[PDB]
Write a protein that binds this ligand. Structure first.
Ligand SMILES: *[C@@H]1O[C@H](CO)[C@@H](O[C@@H]2O[C@H](CO)[C@@H](O)[C@H](O)[C@H]2NC(C)=O)[C@H](O)[C@H]1NC(C)=O
Ligand SMILES: *[C@@H]1O[C@H](CO)[C@@H](O[C@@H]2O[C@H](CO)[C@@H](O)[C@H](O)[C@H]2NC(C)=O)[C@H](O)[C@H]1NC(C)=O
Ligand SMILES: [Ca+2]
Ligand SMILES: [Cl-]
Length: 475
């Protein structure tokens, strides 16, 4: 046999209750089918934000190793994933694969060296920043030092400015590109396609026809969001259909995953899980994910083994019969036997994150419990500091309340949950199991001892895109 084609489709801001297979009122026919015929990842985790998840996805290493613990990489920040990190596509490339990427990058772009084309991907088409207009592909940000809001194009074909795509919805553009890559792929060479869609991140834009099926949803945001998810579902359908028509499917491993929990402020939903995007509650880190592939030993099963987004690197590299030589110490594991055969996971522990300067920007013992952090070990999860907005946000069309609060007093800074038996984080057990709290605090301090300093530089006004009307490198 030849190494399988590895296709990774990463959705943006897809919430736990935003797929039909989780009881969502949003219709996701294709995702449901693909999940039903494959392996549903029920104990799978990502990070609570964009840059965090994507950096861990491509480096297979925690943010405490890369200095990306705090928030994300904003447009004018002179920062990227450290240049000494070896990315997944580089390793797959050395395994004899043809690497392609389509979509959102968000891993740095202030220097040419930070670009996907200079980090492992043979070809690239998409946008560099974290968000933009679906149709114009433009992004506006406030350049502090100048006190002006600059709007500029952020679209690329290779390293060139991708002009002439105005008034064209990004998902259709990206799907068409991916399908062209699938159709025109020269057989005998393994394919690696990383499809990082804009869907379903805000702005809440969708072609008007996807709105009618959801007239029952009164909430404006969820109404528009539902249509966005449905369109994305259709796009996912086209991609898989193409892998089949092209005859690549029989030796393809298709992985679908969200990059973080839904943002209720932007129509997303995580019910019945607690929290949302930006927080370390389950609603922000436990994500929608599944593997669809004829290579799976067991199909049509819900896998409850502990997996994290950082596990994909060593997993795809092994599937690619390659080697992880060249990378710095990895924080993930090869979980293919776990996903395919359902065997005990190699991972029993997961550090969610440690951020000393965490702030909830969105509208809502050896270890210092005032520091925002969370760790999962076995069935237990410990959260310290301010985890983020801790309300449960029920689905709008089913509940006449926007949020449900907990009984936590304002001064609370420690939580212990048995996630296995209490996935909705309803009952704190910290006082009931003091020794487990102590154990996890020691682990938190262990990780803290092996962390690099947080690198969150101030804006560099020289990011100003006015001269060329396009966001891009400046250093
Ligand atoms: C998914 O594939 C469908 C079918 O190929 C795409 O819809 C077609 O788009 C063309 C281009 O304007 C139209 O002329 C056809 O009438 C449409 N075909 C069908 C069968 O409806 C769709 O755009 C693809 N992409 C996404 C993101 O859904
Ligand atoms: C425990 O953690 C908190 C928050 O991480 C620390 O308090 C902050 O310390 C920084 C460090 O220079 C200040 O700039 C912040 O303004 C402080 N407050 C907050 C809310 O972040 C605290 O000092 C840590 N150490 C101890 C010994 O408690
Ligand atoms: Ca995101
Ligand atoms: Cl975090």
């Amino acid at each position: 046999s030849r190494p399988p084609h590895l296709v990774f489709l990463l959705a943006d801001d897809l919430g736990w209750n935003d797929v039909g297979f989780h009881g969502s009122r949003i219709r996701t026919p294709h995702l449901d089918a693909l999940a039903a015929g494959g392996v549903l990842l029920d104990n799978y985790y990502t990070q609570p934000l964009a840059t965090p998840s994507r950096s861990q996805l491509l480096t297979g290493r925690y943010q405490i190793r890369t200095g990306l613990q705090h928030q994300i990489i904003w447009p004018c920040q002179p920062s990227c994933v450290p240049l000494d990190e070896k990315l997944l596509p580089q390793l797959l490339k050395e395994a004899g694969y043809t690497t392609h990427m389509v979509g959102k990058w968000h891993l740095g772009m202030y220097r040419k060296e930070c670009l996907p084309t200079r980090r492992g991907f043979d070809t690239y088409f998409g946008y560099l920043l974290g968000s933009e207009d679906y149709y114009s592909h433009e992004r506006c940000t406030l350049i502090d030092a100048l006190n002006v809001t600059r709007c500029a194009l952020d679209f690329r074909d290779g390293e060139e400015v991708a002009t002439g795509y105005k008034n064209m919805y990004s998902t259709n553009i990206f799907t068409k590109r991916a399908i062209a890559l699938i159709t025109n792929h020269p057989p005998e060479k393994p394919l690696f396609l990383y499809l990082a869609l804009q869907s379903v991140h805000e702005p809440l834009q969708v072609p008007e026809e996807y709105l009618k099926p959801y007239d029952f949803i009164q909430d404006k945001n969820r109404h528009h969001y539902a249509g966005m998810v449905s369109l994305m579902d259709e796009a996912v359908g086209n991609v898989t259909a193409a892998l089949k028509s092209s005859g690549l499917w029989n030796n393809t491993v298709f992985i679908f995953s969200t990059d973080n929990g839904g943002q209720t402020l932007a129509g997303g939903n995580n019910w019945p899980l607690r929290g949302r995007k930006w927080s370390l509650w389950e609603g922000g880190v436990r994500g929608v994910g599944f593997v669809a592939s004829p290579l799976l030993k067991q199909k049509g099963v819900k896998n409850r083994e502990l997996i994290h987004i950082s596990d994909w690197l060593p997993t795809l590299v092994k599937l690619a019969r390659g080697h992880t030589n060249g990378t710095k110490p990895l924080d993930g594991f090869d979980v293919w036997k776990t996903i395919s055969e359902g065997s005990p996971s190699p991972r029993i522990e997961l550090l969610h994150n440690i951020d000393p300067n965490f702030v909830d920007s969105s509208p809502c013992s050896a270890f210092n419990t005032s520091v925002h952090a969370a760790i999962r070990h076995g069935n237990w999860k410990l959260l310290t500091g301010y985890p983020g907005c801790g309300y449960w946000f029920p689905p709008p069309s089913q509940y006449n309340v926007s949020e449900i609060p907990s009984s936590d007093p304002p001064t609370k800074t420690l939580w212990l949950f048995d996630i296995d038996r209490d996935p909705e984080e309803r009952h704190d057990l910290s006082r009931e199991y003091p020794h487990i709290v102590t154990k996890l605090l020691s682990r938190l301090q262990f990780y803290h001892k092996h962390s690099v300093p947080v690198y969150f530089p101030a804006q560099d006004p020289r990011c100003d895109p006015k001269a060329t009307g396009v966001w891009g490198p400046w250093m």
